[PDB]
C-alpha cells in the first residue's frame, strides 16, 4: 500500500550474528521481516549496509521457499515465493529468484470458522 516503504522495518528471528566490521547482519531461524503490509519469511536474512551508509541497505532472504506478501492499494494482496528474496531499500522493487512465483488474490475471508462448498455441478447427466 502507499506508504509501506516509509515504514520502519521489523525483523524477528531465533538467532542473530554480525561480521567483524558490523555492516553485515545475519538472521536465522524462522525469520520474519515486515515493513507496513510487506512481509518476507525466510530461513536466513542478510542485511548489508555498505560502508555503514544509512539508506543503502540491502535485504536478502533465503528459504525453501522464502515467501513474500504485500497488500495493494487496489485491495488485492500480492503473494509469492522463490529461493531468494532481494530487496534493495533505495529501489522501488523486490526481486524473486529461483523457481519464482507471484500471484494476485481477488477475494478473501477470515474467521474462527469458515465453511467452503467443495462440490460443484456445472453439468449433470440424467439417464431416465
Amino acid at each position: 500500500v502507499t506508504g509501506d516503504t516509509d515504514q520502519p522495518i521489523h525483523i524477528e528471528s531465533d538467532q542473530q550474528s554480525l561480521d567483524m566490521q558490523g555492516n553485515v547482519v545475519t538472521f536465522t531461524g524462522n525469520v520474519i521481516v515486515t515493513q507496513g503490509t510487506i512481509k518476507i519469511n525466510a530461513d536466513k536474512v542478510v542485511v548489508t549496509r555498505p560502508g555503514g551508509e544509512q539508506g543503502k541497505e540491502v535485504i536478502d532472504g533465503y528459504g525453501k521457499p522464502a515467501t513474500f506478501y504485500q497488500m495493494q492499494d487496489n485491495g488485492k494482496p500480492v503473494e509469492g515465493h522463490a529461493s531468494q528474496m532481494h530487496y534493495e531499500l533505495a529501489k522501488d522493487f523486490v526481486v524473486l529468484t529461483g523457481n519464482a512465483y507471484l500471484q494476485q488474490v481477488d477475494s478473501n475471508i477470515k474467521g474462527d470458522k469458515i465453511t467452503y462448498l467443495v462440490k460443484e455441478q456445472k453439468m449433470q447427466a440424467f439417464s431416465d
Binding site: 521489523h10 531465533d14 544509512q54
Partner: peptide
C-alpha cells in the same frame, strides 16, 4: 529518508536498532 531497521530476538524478547 532512510527508515530504521529494528531486530527482535525471539528467544530473549530483546530488540535493538541495527
Amino acid at each position: 529518508k532512510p527508515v530504521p531497521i529494528i531486530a527482535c530476538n525471539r528467544k530473549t524478547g530483546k530488540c535493538r536498532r541495527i
